[PDB]
Design an enzyme around this catalytic site. Structure first.
Site, PDB file in Angstrom:
ATOM      1  N   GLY B  47       0.643  -1.424  -0.246  1.00  0.00           N
ATOM      2  CA  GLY B  47      -0.154  -0.231  -0.001  1.00  0.00           C
ATOM      3  C   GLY B  47       0.770   1.037  -0.275  1.00  0.00           C
ATOM      4  O   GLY B  47       2.250   1.578   0.657  1.00  0.00           O
ATOM      5  N   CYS B  67       5.667  -5.599   1.256  1.00  0.00           N
ATOM      6  CA  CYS B  67       5.530  -4.500   2.034  1.00  0.00           C
ATOM      7  C   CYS B  67       5.062  -4.109   3.192  1.00  0.00           C
ATOM      8  O   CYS B  67       5.620  -4.139   4.111  1.00  0.00           O
ATOM      9  CB  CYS B  67       5.398  -3.258   0.441  1.00  0.00           C
ATOM     10  SG  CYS B  67       5.200  -2.016   0.433  1.00  0.00           S
ATOM     11  N   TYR B  68       4.160  -3.450   2.672  1.00  0.00           N
ATOM     12  CA  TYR B  68       3.553  -2.932   3.794  1.00  0.00           C
ATOM     13  C   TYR B  68       2.436  -3.801   4.530  1.00  0.00           C
ATOM     14  O   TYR B  68       2.731  -3.881   6.010  1.00  0.00           O
ATOM     15  CB  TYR B  68       2.063  -1.807   3.608  1.00  0.00           C
ATOM     16  CG  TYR B  68       1.021  -0.573   4.572  1.00  0.00           C
ATOM     17  CD1 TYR B  68       0.118  -1.710   4.953  1.00  0.00           C
ATOM     18  CD2 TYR B  68       1.789   0.142   5.345  1.00  0.00           C
ATOM     19  CE1 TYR B  68      -0.660  -1.209   6.307  1.00  0.00           C
ATOM     20  CE2 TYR B  68       1.029   0.806   6.332  1.00  0.00           C
ATOM     21  CZ  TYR B  68       0.012   0.342   6.547  1.00  0.00           C
ATOM     22  OH  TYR B  68      -0.788   0.911   7.955  1.00  0.00           O
ATOM     23  N   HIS B 162       7.961  -6.948  -3.361  1.00  0.00           N
ATOM     24  CA  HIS B 162       7.101  -7.459  -3.881  1.00  0.00           C
ATOM     25  C   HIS B 162       6.948  -8.353  -5.094  1.00  0.00           C
ATOM     26  O   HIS B 162       7.263  -8.272  -6.148  1.00  0.00           O
ATOM     27  CB  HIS B 162       6.093  -6.283  -5.094  1.00  0.00           C
ATOM     28  CG  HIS B 162       5.924  -4.672  -4.278  1.00  0.00           C
ATOM     29  ND1 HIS B 162       4.822  -4.475  -3.489  1.00  0.00           N
ATOM     30  CD2 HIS B 162       6.703  -3.679  -4.082  1.00  0.00           C
ATOM     31  CE1 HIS B 162       4.557  -4.031  -3.110  1.00  0.00           C
ATOM     32  NE2 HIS B 162       5.969  -2.865  -3.183  1.00  0.00           N
ATOM     33  N   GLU B 164       5.074 -10.560  -5.906  1.00  0.00           N
ATOM     34  CA  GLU B 164       3.539 -10.187  -7.230  1.00  0.00           C
ATOM     35  C   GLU B 164       3.681 -10.298  -8.235  1.00  0.00           C
ATOM     36  O   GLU B 164       3.580 -10.964  -9.107  1.00  0.00           O
ATOM     37  CB  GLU B 164       2.249  -9.465  -6.507  1.00  0.00           C
ATOM     38  CG  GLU B 164       2.376  -8.025  -6.569  1.00  0.00           C
ATOM     39  CD  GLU B 164       3.426  -8.305  -4.769  1.00  0.00           C
ATOM     40  OE1 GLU B 164       3.789  -8.759  -4.230  1.00  0.00           O
ATOM     41  OE2 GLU B 164       3.196  -6.766  -4.844  1.00  0.00           O
ATOM     42  N   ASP B 218     -13.373  -9.493 -24.589  1.00  0.00           N
ATOM     43  CA  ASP B 218     -14.435 -10.211 -23.685  1.00  0.00           C
ATOM     44  C   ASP B 218     -16.169 -11.212 -24.285  1.00  0.00           C
ATOM     45  O   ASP B 218     -16.102 -12.202 -24.056  1.00  0.00           O
ATOM     46  CB  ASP B 218     -14.644  -9.442 -21.990  1.00  0.00           C
ATOM     47  CG  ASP B 218     -12.942  -9.083 -21.522  1.00  0.00           C
ATOM     48  OD1 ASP B 218     -12.362 -10.099 -21.576  1.00  0.00           O
ATOM     49  OD2 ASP B 218     -12.855  -8.181 -21.313  1.00  0.00           O
ATOM     50  N   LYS B 340      -7.473 -10.834 -18.494  1.00  0.00           N
ATOM     51  CA  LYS B 340      -7.446 -10.457 -19.465  1.00  0.00           C
ATOM     52  C   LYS B 340      -5.637 -11.717 -20.713  1.00  0.00           C
ATOM     53  O   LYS B 340      -6.204 -11.851 -21.654  1.00  0.00           O
ATOM     54  CB  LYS B 340      -6.847  -9.386 -20.171  1.00  0.00           C
ATOM     55  CG  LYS B 340      -8.703  -8.826 -20.402  1.00  0.00           C
TER      56      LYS B 340
END
Ligand SMILES: O=c1[nH]c(=O)c2[nH+]cn([C@@H]3O[C@H](COP(=O)(O)O)[C@@H](O)[C@H]3O)c2[nH]1
Ligand SMILES: O=c1[nH]c(=O)c2[nH+]cn([C@@H]3O[C@H](COP(=O)(O)O)[C@@H](O)[C@H]3O)c2[nH]1
Ligand SMILES: [Ca+2]
Lengths: 517, 477
Positions: B47, B67-68, B162, B164, B218, B340
């Protein structure tokens, strides 16, 4: 003394022809196309240059020379030199034809100078097969305007949508272009010259030569040095140094400062500098300029007036850019004259110094009363730049970008208040400092920030503007290296609260202007 | 199931995407009702700010703070591609006197990492200065000593970086180690799509399907799968709202008919309705709210004009990002757990044209949010012209495909030549909350701009958007 009449057909490059006449030491006499015979008949005109323009000579409302004015040139034997529109005007005036081109030309283009023996050197003859078949339809020779050119090929700048389709009178075809057959024309009897390209621009490599050939070899001029006129003018004001006062609006710009330098050295304690803070300057600019002026000229009288509240309250609610401009000009005059009266001197014995340059007098002749003193009437920006070096002034005044009179009022889009100004001042400051920090400032002609009344996801949207400029009416948008721009934009968005979006102006002049408003 | 709590990170979708890569089911929630669920592990997000904590330690549910999350865990327990070091003699920068003050293991989260050095993505302004409780110092960085922390008692894990994002080379392995080895997990997202279609096939004989057709990636591939099953019972509807780009209504309708010849597509021209309703509206939220209510109105009116509401099912191309952000007919959303990136490969697996798999997303409200201020025909016409030139040139010069999203924007502000001011917008998008402005080669940008200023009347100035997300957004409004 021996002056060339330069006529304005609306060209974006008009200042550049006047500039080339200054480089070649010939006195320019700028006037509009609609000039009357009465205003020129008594002058020492040795030749006339017809400029280009944004008009089509076929259509209605297009600028034309009056029949009597053109007939005057022929009768008096005055040589004529038409560029772009000027050539086409000549054509239309004398039985010729002009239509819109099959292919429009813009940019650096090579053109073949024509001669009886040179006719074979044209390979593109099929675009209008044999080169003898094409030029049999046109009179050629075996041309003074191209004297000492050496090469039979020359690079020139193009910018035209219309072309001469049928030559006027008894004209010679003298040059051809890949996309323009009648590229240059010549008349021996009346000394009429015409080119489709623009020899006034720098990119036209042999331009300065064609202007030289016309002035001296063709028009038989004998004389005028622009970079000598101010020296002569200052040497004659010297006789007033004891009985007269000199007043000058001090802005912090190069023009007003250099002028003040040369003039303060004469009038000393009789010179008065007035710096008016209109409240529309940049971050710390009001303080920084006043300190700069005192540090450069310690013995000089400098009166500073804080007029910020006067301008700001008068600008409340005003969104129209012309209304802004007219109020600011009106209030400047009122504040200035208030400062002059506060000096308590004889108004009937005062000179008003202005750093007015040639572009200004050219522009002025288009579309408390003091004895005016403008030493730099015939000078250009680059002339003033080297004059500042000859005074050994700091590099900072020689390099710094021009700043408009109305200031940030034309840079805050829409309603102007102190909250907006403060935000713009922060953004512009970060922008300018960083351009100096990354060493781009000096190679940019003018750079600044703009604040929009429109919003994005809610806070204000800022635009960064930066250009390289050729003259008053022509400029290109500057291409800031993406790595530097990223660092500048990242800095602004984190440091300045109230801005959530930075845009960059990618428009040149024309069609856009340098400023937004 | 793994719990992943949102602390407002710009990378929140990327941690969810990594759990999708590892084949782990996610339960996304805010920073409670969690005791009834089958949770085997909890992840605490990052964050920009820089609670049932007791239940996690009590039920022995391991925590993974990024992180946070690492810093908050440290509190509760009292930027770029950098190479972190996981042995103490290897630390070159510092030499052995510094690590002497801290406890070091002789770690489960870095299992099978091979190397003692790993490249990770950084984005932080705050750092842990004093370790909590009885924690081990596990990894260090050049700019951060306390980089990664571990507690054996509660299976608490904390990393400053991070993992991720893609830039974190060993990211997926760390996620794998937390989920399978530490949390002892024992749901394939791409498989669920296929399973939901086979179940709907059992309703082909009696039920019907309806789908709002936009022309976007989509809604078309969803229709492509479902229409194959329901054939003539399938009813796709396309609504022109007068907020689309130049000739787009004609181009979308023709494309759909050419790609799916046996599909029942009904086009309804609602331009006049949408425009009039939007007269005078400037507030961006108000624009969106109006458009949505007029979409629904025109949508169900069109369904009324075609032949049993009790049997009809509504197909939607709702993706996982859409479902995550949030937290009459039978709603059918097979793509509910997909991104996506996944739908694009599904488009290829259908042998569908390269045009749709590559086409930039287009927002529901259309040009309404791309025209600043009052929307009218005059403004729309100009924006359609500029946008069409911009896009076509981006395709011509081979830039379109490497760009995530590009479009023109018209502003209410005016400039001298007094005409309208246009802005070009082009970005490269990592995730829903992270995008960087695209750097169009100056030679090409000057060609596009020169073409626009010469061809389009009503515009004398164009600007380029050099703002990234964060802090700015992709769209203006
Ligand atoms: O003294 C001034 N008063 C004004 O009202 C004004 N408006 C524009 N400028 C400056 O003129 C140059 C050309 O700008 P435009 O292409 O926007 O007219 C640019 O250098 C502008 O900074 C002004 N200077
Ligand atoms: O269907 C939509 N209806 C909307 O109201 C809307 N607003 C933004 N967007 C799209 O979402 C992405 C991120 O938007 P922002 O960065 O502007 O918030 C970008 O891709 C935008 O195009 C929308 N799509
Ligand atoms: Ca007085």
């Amino acid at each position: 003394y021996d002056k060339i009449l330069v006529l304005n057909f609306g060209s974006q490059y008009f200042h550049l022809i006047v500039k080339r006449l200054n480089n070649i030491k010939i006195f320019s006499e700028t006037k509009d196309y609609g000039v009357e015979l009465k205003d020129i008949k008594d002058m020492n005109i040795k030749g006339v240059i017809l400029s280009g323009g944004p008009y089509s000579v076929t259509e209605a409302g297009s600028p034309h020379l009056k029949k009597e004015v053109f007939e005057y040139f022929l009768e008096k034997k005055i040589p004529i030199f038409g560029i772009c529109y000027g050539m086409q005007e000549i054509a239309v005036q004398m039985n010729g034809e002009v239509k819109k081109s099959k292919t429009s030309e813009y940019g650096c283009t090579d053109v073949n100078i024509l001669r009886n023996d040179n006719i074979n050197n044209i390979t593109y003859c099929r675009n209008f097969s044999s080169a003898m078949d094409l030029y049999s339809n046109y009179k050629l020779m075996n041309c003074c305007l191209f004297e000492n050119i050496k090469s039979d090929i020359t690079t020139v700048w193009m910018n035209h949508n219309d072309e001469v389709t049928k030559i006027p009178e008894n004209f010679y075809l003298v040059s051809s272009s890949e996309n323009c057959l009648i590229c240059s024309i010549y008349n021996k009897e009346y000394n009429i010259y015409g080119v489709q390209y623009h020899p006034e621009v720098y990119e036209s490599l042999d331009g300065e030569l064609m202007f030289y050939n016309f002035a001296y070899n063709i028009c038989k001029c004998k004389k005028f040095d622009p970079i000598r006129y101010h020296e002569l003018e200052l040497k004659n004001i010297e006789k007033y140094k004891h009985d007269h006062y000199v007043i000058a609006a001090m802005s912090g710009g190069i023009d007003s400062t250099v002028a003040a330098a040369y003039t303060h050295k004469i009038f000393k304690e009789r010179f008065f500098g007035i710096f008016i803070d209109n409240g529309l300057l940049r971050k710390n600019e009001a303080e920084n300029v006043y300190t700069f002026l005192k540090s450069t000229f310690p013995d000089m009288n400098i009166t500073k007036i804080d007029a910020s509240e006067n301008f700001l309250s008068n600008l409340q609610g005003v969104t129209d850019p012309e209304q802004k401009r007219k109020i600011i000009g009106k209030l400047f005059i009122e504040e200035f004259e208030k400062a002059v009266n506060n000096i308590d001197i004889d108004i009937n014995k005062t000179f008003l110094l202005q750093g007015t340059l040639y572009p200004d007098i050219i522009e002025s002749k288009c579309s408390l009363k003091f004895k005016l003193f403008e030493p730099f009437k015939y000078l250009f920006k680059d002339d003033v730049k080297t004059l500042s070096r000859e005074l050994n002034l700091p590099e900072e005044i020689t390099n710094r970008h021009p700043f408009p009179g109305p200031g940030l009022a034309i840079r805050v889009i829409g309603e102007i208040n102190k909250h907006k100004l403060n935000i713009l001042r922060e953004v512009d400051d970060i922008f300018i400092n960083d351009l100096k920090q990354y060493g781009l400032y000096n190679q940019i002609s003018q750079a600044f920030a703009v604040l929009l009344s429109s919003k994005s996801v809610y806070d204000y949207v800022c635009v960064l503007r930066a250009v390289k400029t050729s003259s008053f009416m022509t400029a290109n948008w500057y291409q800031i290296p993406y790595d530097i721009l990223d660092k500048i934009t990242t800095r602004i968005l984190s440091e300045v609260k109230g801005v959530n979006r930075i845009l960059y102006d990618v428009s040149s002049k024309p069609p856009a202007t340098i400023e937004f408003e």
